[PDB]
Design a protein around this nucleic acid. Structure first.
Lengths: 141, 94, 38, 175, 136
RNA sequence: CGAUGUCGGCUCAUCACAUCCUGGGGCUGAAGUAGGUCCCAAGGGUAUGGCUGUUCGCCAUUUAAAGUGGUACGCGAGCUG
RNA sequence: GUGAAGAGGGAAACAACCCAGACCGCCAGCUAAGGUCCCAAAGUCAUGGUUAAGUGGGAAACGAUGUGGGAAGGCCCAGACAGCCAGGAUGUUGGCUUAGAAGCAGCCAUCAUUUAAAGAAAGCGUAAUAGCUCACUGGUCGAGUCGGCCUGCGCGGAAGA
């Protein structure tokens, strides 16, 4: 049939929200309460790493109310920090813009572990390595 | 290696050739050694798939002609001008 | 539908349906891929 | 083959076995207007059976046919059909009267089908038609004549569709 | 386009086909097109063909092209009563016969080779058919 | 070749569809709008003038549209010259 | 070779093609090319098979899951093939450009896991991502099947006074 409905997902900064372009209209269509979420989100984001873009998934009900689960920041972002870079490489694999030690990846894999399916640390660590190779970020043991 | 079944042929003539080609059979000869040539007619369809592998032209055939066997090699092949049919294959006893 | 003598099949969603002597083509997606004869 | 070598009629319904028709009969609808043509009549306890009429080797094209064609009428007297038939765009009305349904797409003049029996019209809305029907064949045809007032079109989406949205959408331009 | 650079002679006869071949086997190639049927390539047919192949096989494999056109074949011009002189060379035809190998691909899969030749062909004037490399 | 009167016009048409319009559709880069293009469709309809011997063409202004081609490049035992 | 200078019989009619050279006659016979459903003389013949187009009774390039006939190969009861139940995960909303183009505008990346198994991917979709479906993979069913090949006969292609 036709229709539409919610359970939205978005990656908003740690301590910042409400802007129309970034947020607002995005979930506003579903019928979410911008104001409430703005303060609600940034409320817990204070405890979580500030200044780090964390992806949150909002789920609206018929009540138009909503709940959201704050996960861990994207692997790509985490790699940028570890590598100390700002952006990717444009042409990954061809030109490396940064590097990350095998130890760091394990740390990032441990952070993403919650959202990763990886049965063991090796799996999770590699899962991110695939993201690094896609960012043009080399990894030295 | 393949162990081909083929059989005596006995009429020389282009015409008779045309008659053979109306069946799958194409005329063909064994010649070699100290005994006069053996006019056989192998079956195309078998031999088609068998000559498609390199092995044919490379290892020994043993052409079973009515109950006896003669070990030959396929040397030369005068096939149809443009069709995957054969018309002829010369076989030298080696 | 789009009319030519031949243009074969066009994608993997081109089923080729024969209604009469002409050979039409149903397509899931594009109506421009639908042939009357092609 | 497959279907054409598959046999099934429950004991929820009833039959009038005949040598040149396959008749089902019962309540909620009934009566069978598809008939033998190229197929035998055998029977079974739990199946109204038929292999191909002999002296014709192509009769299993007509048989695999005959198969789904019989069983569907049975589904019609046990369960509804033609479940709904929506339409994209609005102010396109309804009527739902004696068996006529009006619908507008800028029709000054009324557009109606005095429907046969064995197919029902209902809606709650001016964007929807909710029909339960019996006899998948019968119904389906008269059902088409409705939505066929105007075809759906891709450049604004509007035009009476089906139940499900199976349109293509092409952007408008020049704005 | 393609012709004798030093001409043996200017003009030549109609010629006849007697069909068949002896030229039936790739010797540079591993895939190829042979003929079915008989005709002429006017060499703008060779040219179109060399082109269509190259755009497809790319800079993988290599191409050879058996038959180079050697019979002129005249056309006597328009609006003059016929039989007053023999015409002038407007062509270089290539008399081709069945089983006569046209072109020759190498270096690329059996399927690529077919669907490069299938693409060339139609800009060829007769029915074709595939060649496999062949042990011989 | 023991005469089959040329072109053009006029007059009178008639046929074919490879359709210009109307009719019915497909696709559309199908917003609408008029269209573009193609398919089906010959029932009916399908322009006057200016110039030029030319048919044609070019130009002017409409028209729903001023189709194309065939009929001894239609028609002189019907007209014109 | 015939016609010329040859009738006759066949090819509808049809100087030349095919068959056959008319001394003459006979409500005589036997054949020939070619024919035997009716016009219109003789098989609604026998046997077997093919074709569905009115092909037969005009045409090619070329296209096709139309059919018949033949052979091999790939997969298959340790359950294939299709659909359906689904897998469709996870890293994953990667970069330039653009707030945001982050598989799929263009350009680059075209890797890898989770596993029993799951392409940074064919297209739709979106400026672009997100999502949907698919060559890609798991389950249900229950028996042959999937593409190529040779080859007989068809189909379209096939529009004019």
């Amino acid at each position: 049939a036709k229709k539409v409905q919610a359970y939205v997902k978005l990656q908003v900064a740690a301590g910042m929200a409400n802007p129309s372009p970034p947020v607002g209209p995005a979930l506003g269509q579903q019928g979410v309460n911008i104001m409430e979420f703005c303060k609600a989100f940034n409320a817990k984001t204070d405890s979580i790493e500030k200044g780090l873009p964390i992806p949150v998934v909002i789920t609206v009900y018929a009540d138009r109310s909503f709940t959201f689960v704050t996960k861990t920041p994207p692997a790509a972002v985490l790699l940028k920090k570890a590598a100390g870079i700002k952006s990717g490489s444009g042409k990954p694999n061809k030109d490396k813009v940064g590097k990350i030690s095998r130890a760091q990846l394990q740390e990032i894999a441990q952070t993403k572990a919650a959202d990763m399916t990886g049965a063991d640390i090796e799996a999770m660590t590699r899962s991110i390595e695939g993201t690094a190779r896609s960012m043009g970020l080399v990894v030295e043991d | 290696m393949f162990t081909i079944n083929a059989e005596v042929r006995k009429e020389q003539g282009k015409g008779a050739s045309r008659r053979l080609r109306a069946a799958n059979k194409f005329p063909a000869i064994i010649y070699g050694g100290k005994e006069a040539p053996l006019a056989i007619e192998l079956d195309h369809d078998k031999v088609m798939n068998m000559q498609a592998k390199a092995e044919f032209y490379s290892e020994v055939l043993t052409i079973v002609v009515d109950g006896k066997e003669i070990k030959v090699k396929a040397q030369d092949v005068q096939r149809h001008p443009y069709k995957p049919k054969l018309q002829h294959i010369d076989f030298v006893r080696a | 539908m789009k009319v030519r003598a031949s243009v074969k099949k066009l994608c993997r969603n081109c089923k080729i349906v024969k209604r009469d002597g002409v050979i039409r083509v149903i397509c899931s997606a594009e109506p421009k891929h639908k042939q009357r004869q092609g | 083959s497959r279907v054409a070598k598959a046999p099934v009629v429950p004991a929820g319904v009833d039959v009038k076995i005949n040598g040149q028709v396959i008749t089902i009969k019962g309540k909620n609808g009934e009566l069978t207007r598809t008939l033998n043509d190229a197929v035998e009549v055998k029977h079974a306890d739990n199946t109204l059976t038929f292999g191909p009429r002999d002296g014709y080797a192509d009769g299993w094209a007509q048989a695999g046919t005959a198969r789904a064609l019989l069983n569907s009428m049975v589904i019609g007297v046990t369960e509804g059909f033609t479940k709904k038939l929506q339409l994209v765009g609005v102010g396109y009305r309804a009527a739902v009267k004696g068996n006529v349904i009006n619908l507008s797409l800028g029709f000054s003049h009324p557009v109606d089908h005095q429907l046969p029996a064995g197919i029902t019209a209902e809606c709650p809305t001016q964007t929807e038609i909710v029909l339960k029907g019996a006899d998948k064949q019968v119904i389906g045809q008269v059902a088409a004549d409705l939505r066929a007032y105007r075809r759906p079109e891709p450049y604004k989406g509007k035009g009476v569709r089906y139940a499900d949205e199976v349109v293509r959408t092409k952007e408008a331009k020049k704005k | 386009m393609l012709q004798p650079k030093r001409t043996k002679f200017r003009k030549m006869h109609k010629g006849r086909n007697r069909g068949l071949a002896q030229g039936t086997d790739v010797s540079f190639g591993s895939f190829g097109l042979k003929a079915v049927g008989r005709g002429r390539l006017t060499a703008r047919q060779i040219e179109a063909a060399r082109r269509a192949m190259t755009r497809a096989v790319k800079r993988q494999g290599k191409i050879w092209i058996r038959v180079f056109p050697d019979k002129p074949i005249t056309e006597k011009p328009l609006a003059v009563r016929m039989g007053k002189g023999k015409g002038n060379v407007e062509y270089w035809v290539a008399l081709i016969q069945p089983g006569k190998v046209l072109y020759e691909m190498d270096g690329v899969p059996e399927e690529l080779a077919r669907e490069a030749f299938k693409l060339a062909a139609a800009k060829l004037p007769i029915k074709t058919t595939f060649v496999t490399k062949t042990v011989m």
